[PDB]
Amino acid sequence: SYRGVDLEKLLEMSTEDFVKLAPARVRRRFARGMTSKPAGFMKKLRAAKLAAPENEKPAPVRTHMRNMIIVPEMIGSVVGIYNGKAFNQVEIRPEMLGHYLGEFSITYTPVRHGRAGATTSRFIPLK
Amino acid sequence: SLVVQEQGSFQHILRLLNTNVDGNIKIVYALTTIKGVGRRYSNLVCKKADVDLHKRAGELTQEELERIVQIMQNPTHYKIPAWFLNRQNDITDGKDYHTLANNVESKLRDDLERLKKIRAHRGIRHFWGLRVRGQ
Amino acid sequence: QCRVCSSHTGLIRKYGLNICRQCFREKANDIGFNKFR
Amino acid sequence: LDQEKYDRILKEVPTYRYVSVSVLVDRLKIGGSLARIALRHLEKEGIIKPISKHSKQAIYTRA
Amino acid sequence: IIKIRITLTSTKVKQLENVSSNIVKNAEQHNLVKKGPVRLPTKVLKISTRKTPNGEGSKTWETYEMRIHKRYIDLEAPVQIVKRITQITIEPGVDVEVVVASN
Amino acid sequence: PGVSVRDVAAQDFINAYASFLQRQGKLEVPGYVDIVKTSSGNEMPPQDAEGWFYKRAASVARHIYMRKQVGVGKLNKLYGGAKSRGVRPYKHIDASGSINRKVLQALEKIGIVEISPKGGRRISENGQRDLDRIAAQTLEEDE
RNA sequence: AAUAGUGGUGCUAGCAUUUGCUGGUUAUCCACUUCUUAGAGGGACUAUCGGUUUCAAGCCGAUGGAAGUUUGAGGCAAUAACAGGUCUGUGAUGCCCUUAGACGUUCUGGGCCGCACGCGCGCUACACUGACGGAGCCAGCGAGUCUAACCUUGGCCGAGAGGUCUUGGUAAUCUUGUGAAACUCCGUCGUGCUGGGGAUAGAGCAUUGUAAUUAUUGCUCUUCAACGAGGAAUUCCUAGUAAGCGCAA
């Protein structure tokens, strides 16, 4: 329901007006380039898709994951295998639409103060 | 110029949706005391109001206080372009509206709380900033 | 390019010669540059 | 809001030596444009003997 | 028998007044029409670079220079007069060009 | 006893001329004159509500007087201000083009300024017998 | 000296007109170098008078002079313990794994980029010698496209941001007179932390590349939150110098 539309518009609406209900960057990142080998997840996403009961697991392939837009073709699928060392555990939640596939993995642990009792730095020094 | 001497009739308190205006100023500066409207926004609506641009509160016609919110509540009805608005192409309904003073906090928390907890339509690593370092 | 003397940075992209500036001070003579002021 | 802009100025104008914006703001109600419009009215009244004027300031004295 | 134009843009100013003299010398022994060697404003090149291989020390810099001078002459002559004399005024470091632009 | 354009006031000569143009009313004044300011660098639409459109259109005729030609890029780089950037240092102003594109075209309808073969829009004998003649009508304002 | 410029003769438009003051541009043609650029030379030596001193080296006034602070500013000049001087330096070190190399690449997210205090060298302030709005309108040294996308003006659409159609420029010709800013008049504003000051932010439109989320940058509208001249202390900058103001590589 972006434009007040039906939020069950899942298979009925294609990828083209998917871009029409979306902000400006993917409204440019749509004819940005006809990818072939970076379009290799989609040739292998359908290699294992929807052949399961309720709630599945896709066929993740080692990529560079962080860069593609989210597709409507997602349900609860735990995307992500190894593709390096910083792991990308990407389960799908249910349908929160219009975003990159990058905003899920580990990038920085939010560790608070170990010994940060010198908060930024000192004052003007004097001994 | 001249000496015009009116019988007071000036209101230290106004009532335009819980906004009490010290109206001994210019009327475009009077509306800026509310939230969501500034002098970049209130500039044209008094020019849309078709009045004198120097008046205080003691000389305003009583229909115009109805009129100024009427143009406000009907923004696109009287030639306001798309680049003259706050809230634009919404994630829930796609339409475009502007906001008054006491409801900028509306469409604010609920629109951030989805990015705060639900791991929303875009907010999954925009998920700790107004939560851990700026809550 | 990294030309010679522990440098791939601070290259002189101007005037189309592309020299690492560590290895410019010793080559600026025979190019025909000279200091005067 | 009828007499304070009516008696101290329309009668007690020629009491001073010269006139600037300094004397007119001695009342805390006569604001900037209110003090400005005072001489702007009074130049029509002919009491102002002008000396020099530009956009930052004038030099005005009475008749 | 066509109006021509010669340019010479060199960087040894002592070795440009010998060449520009013998250009106007053998033309005036044949007494052609000419206009004098017009001398253009010179061009200087410069590059500031600091003076250390590493980075540890105090800071001010260098400044290197290279000077380019350029002057040019217009001329008219029969082609047999000019096509011999432009081949005997060679000198290293010096550039010579012929332009016969008669638009 | 006969003057050119060059021996009148500068600021005042525009004021007497545009006020005559205020009596004319023969200008394609678009709808968005209330909203759109002069550039991006300025903060506000001007304190003139009406006569500013007469103001800029008068002075652009005043500037092509001494000149040979004017394109549109020139009066972009002209119009008297400094771009604020906030906490960062300043930079020069560059002016908007749509508000200058039509007002240059808004004088071809009244025979003032037109395209030179060299590539800019300039006065010809249309203004050279009339715009000076109404500049000669400003000589009555000299007394 | 058509790759600078004026001075006329013209074609030529205004012209108060009436002798006139502004224009007119390739080529209307001729004559010019003062301003301009670059070669060749000249010119300042503290000159000439008056003081002062062992009457010495010199230092102070004086009038002349473009110039009288080494005439203004730089470049260049070796005694020494920082084992930071290392380019296919070789060390001319024998262990670094120094040969399923932990030294390559392509092919991968994460380097300078996590809360509550800085000695980080001024940045935007704290305002009427001010903001905002109209006008007036002045410069200097540098830069650039072929095996290839660099400069960019008109006519274009649009509120910017930009997009499209064209050109011009291998270089005093084109961008570019780089119409820079402070300042300058005419206004609006009225001393309150208000229209001073926009620091965190949410909604949007654009561009650049294989790719901008952890906002790469840029224009919209909102929000306006510390901040009333600074305790003890302590300073890259020298008469067109100190300070503001630039926005060229």
UniProtKB/Swiss-Prot annotation, chain A:
Arranged from A to Z, the UniProt key words for this protein are: Acetylation, Cytoplasm, Isopeptide bond, Ribonucleoprotein, Ribosomal protein, Ribosome biogenesis, Ubl conjugation
**What positions does the cross-link Glycyl lysine isopeptide (Lys-Gly) (interchain with G-Cter in ubiquitin) connect?**
9, 20, 49
Q: Which top-rank group of organisms is this from?
A: Eukaryota
Q: How does this protein assemble?
A: Component of the small ribosomal subunit (SSU). Mature yeast ribosomes consist of a small (40S) and a large (60S) subunit. The 40S small subunit contains 1 molecule of ribosomal RNA (18S rRNA) and 33 different proteins (encoded by 57 genes). The large 60S subunit contains 3 rRNA molecules (25S, 5.8S and 5S rRNA) and 46 different proteins (encoded by 81 genes).
Q: Name one GO cellular component term.
A: cytosol
* Pfam entry (one): Ribosomal_S19
Any idea what this protein is called? Small ribosomal subunit protein uS19
Q: Which family does it belong to?
A: Belongs to the universal ribosomal protein uS19 family.
As for subcellular location, the record says:
Cytoplasm
From Swiss-Prot, chain B:
GO biological process terms, alphabetically, are: cytoplasmic translation; endonucleolytic cleavage in ITS1 to separate SSU-rRNA from 5.8S rRNA and LSU-rRNA from tricistronic rRNA transcript (SSU-rRNA, 5.8S rRNA, LSU-rRNA); ribosomal subunit export from nucleus
Please state where this protein is localized.
Cytoplasm
Which residue positions does N6-methyllysine occur at? 47
Q: What are the recorded GO MF terms, alphabetically? A: rRNA binding; structural constituent of ribosome
**Is Kinase among the key words of this record?**
no
Coiled coil where?
A: none
Keywords attached to this entry: Acetylation, Cytoplasm, Isopeptide bond, Methylation, Ribonucleoprotein, Ribosomal protein, RNA-binding, rRNA-binding, Ubl conjugation
**Cross-link Glycyl lysine isopeptide (Lys-Gly) (interchain with G-Cter in ubiquitin) per UniProt, renumbered positions:** 35, 48, 79, 95
Recorded GO CC terms: cytoplasm; cytosol; cytosolic small ribosomal subunit; mitochondrion; small ribosomal subunit
SUPFAM superfamilies, A to Z: S13-like H2TH domain (SSF46946)
Name one matching Pfam family.
Ribosomal_S13
Spell out the InterPro entries in the cross-references.
Rbsml_uS13_C, Ribosomal_uS13, Ribosomal_uS13-like_H2TH, Ribosomal_uS13_CS
Domain of life, per UniProt, equals: Eukaryota
- N-acetylserine occurs at 1
Task: Report what the Swiss-Prot or TrEMBL entry states about this protein's PTMs.
Answer: N-terminally acetylated by acetyltransferase NatA.
The cysteines joined by S-S bonds are none
Its family remark reads: Belongs to the universal ribosomal protein uS13 family.
Subunit details: Component of the small ribosomal subunit (SSU). Mature yeast ribosomes consist of a small (40S) and a large (60S) subunit. The 40S small subunit contains 1 molecule of ribosomal RNA (18S rRNA) and 33 different proteins (encoded by 57 genes). The large 60S subunit contains 3 rRNA molecules (25S, 5.8S and 5S rRNA) and 46 different proteins (encoded by 81 genes).
Something else known: Present with 48100 molecules/cell in log phase SD medium.
Identification of the protein by name: Small ribosomal subunit protein uS13A
Q: Which gene specifies this protein's sequence?
A: RPS18A
Curated annotation (Swiss-Prot), chain C:
Annotated Gene Ontology MF terms? Answer: structural constituent of ribosome; zinc ion binding
Instruction: Paste the cofactor note.
Output: Binds 1 zinc ion per subunit.
Q: What is its main location?
A: cytoplasm
List of residues that carry Phosphoserine: 6
GO biological process entries: cytoplasmic translation
Query: What cofactors does the UniProt entry give for this protein?
Result: Zn(2+)
Provide the protein's localization: Cytoplasm
Q: Which UniProt keyword terms apply here? A: Cytoplasm, Metal-binding, Phosphoprotein, Ribonucleoprotein, Ribosomal protein, Zinc
User: Which positions does UniProt annotate for Zn(2+) binding?
Assistant: 2, 5, 20, 23
GO annotations of cellular component type? cytosol; cytosolic small ribosomal subunit
Task performed by this protein? Component of the ribosome, a large ribonucleoprotein complex responsible for the synthesis of proteins in the cell. The small ribosomal subunit (SSU) binds messenger RNAs (mRNAs) and translates the encoded message by selecting cognate aminoacyl-transfer RNA (tRNA) molecules. The large subunit (LSU) contains the ribosomal catalytic site termed the peptidyl transferase center (PTC), which catalyzes the formation of peptide bonds, thereby polymerizing the amino acids delivered by tRNAs into a polypeptide chain.
Q: Subunit details for this protein?
A: Component of the small ribosomal subunit (SSU). Mature yeast ribosomes consist of a small (40S) and a large (60S) subunit. The 40S small subunit contains 1 molecule of ribosomal RNA (18S rRNA) and 33 different proteins (encoded by 57 genes). The large 60S subunit contains 3 rRNA molecules (25S, 5.8S and 5S rRNA) and 46 different proteins (encoded by 81 genes).
Protein family: Belongs to the universal ribosomal protein uS14 family.
Name listed for the protein in its UniProt record: Small ribosomal subunit protein uS14A
Q: What gene does this protein come from?
A: RPS29A
From Swiss-Prot, chain D:
Chief location = cytoplasm
List locations, semicolon-separated.
Answer: Cytoplasm
Keywords recorded for this protein, A-Z:
Cytoplasm, Methylation, Ribonucleoprotein, Ribosomal protein
Q: Which GO terms describe its molecular function?
A: structural constituent of ribosome
The reply on keyword Plastid is no
GO BP annotations of the record are: cytoplasmic translation
The domain of life for this entry's organism is Eukaryota
The reply on keyword Ribosomal protein is yes
Question: Which protein family is it in?
Answer: Belongs to the eukaryotic ribosomal protein eS25 family.
Its job: Component of the ribosome, a large ribonucleoprotein complex responsible for the synthesis of proteins in the cell. The small ribosomal subunit (SSU) binds messenger RNAs (mRNAs) and translates the encoded message by selecting cognate aminoacyl-transfer RNA (tRNA) molecules. The large subunit (LSU) contains the ribosomal catalytic site termed the peptidyl transferase center (PTC), which catalyzes the formation of peptide bonds, thereby polymerizing the amino acids delivered by tRNAs into a polypeptide chain.
Question: What is noted besides the main data?
Answer: It is presumed that the precursor part of S25 is engaged in assembling of the small subunit, thus being essential in ribosome maturation.
Its subunit composition reads: Component of the small ribosomal subunit (SSU). Mature yeast ribosomes consist of a small (40S) and a large (60S) subunit. The 40S small subunit contains 1 molecule of ribosomal RNA (18S rRNA) and 33 different proteins (encoded by 57 genes). The large 60S subunit contains 3 rRNA molecules (25S, 5.8S and 5S rRNA) and 46 different proteins (encoded by 81 genes).
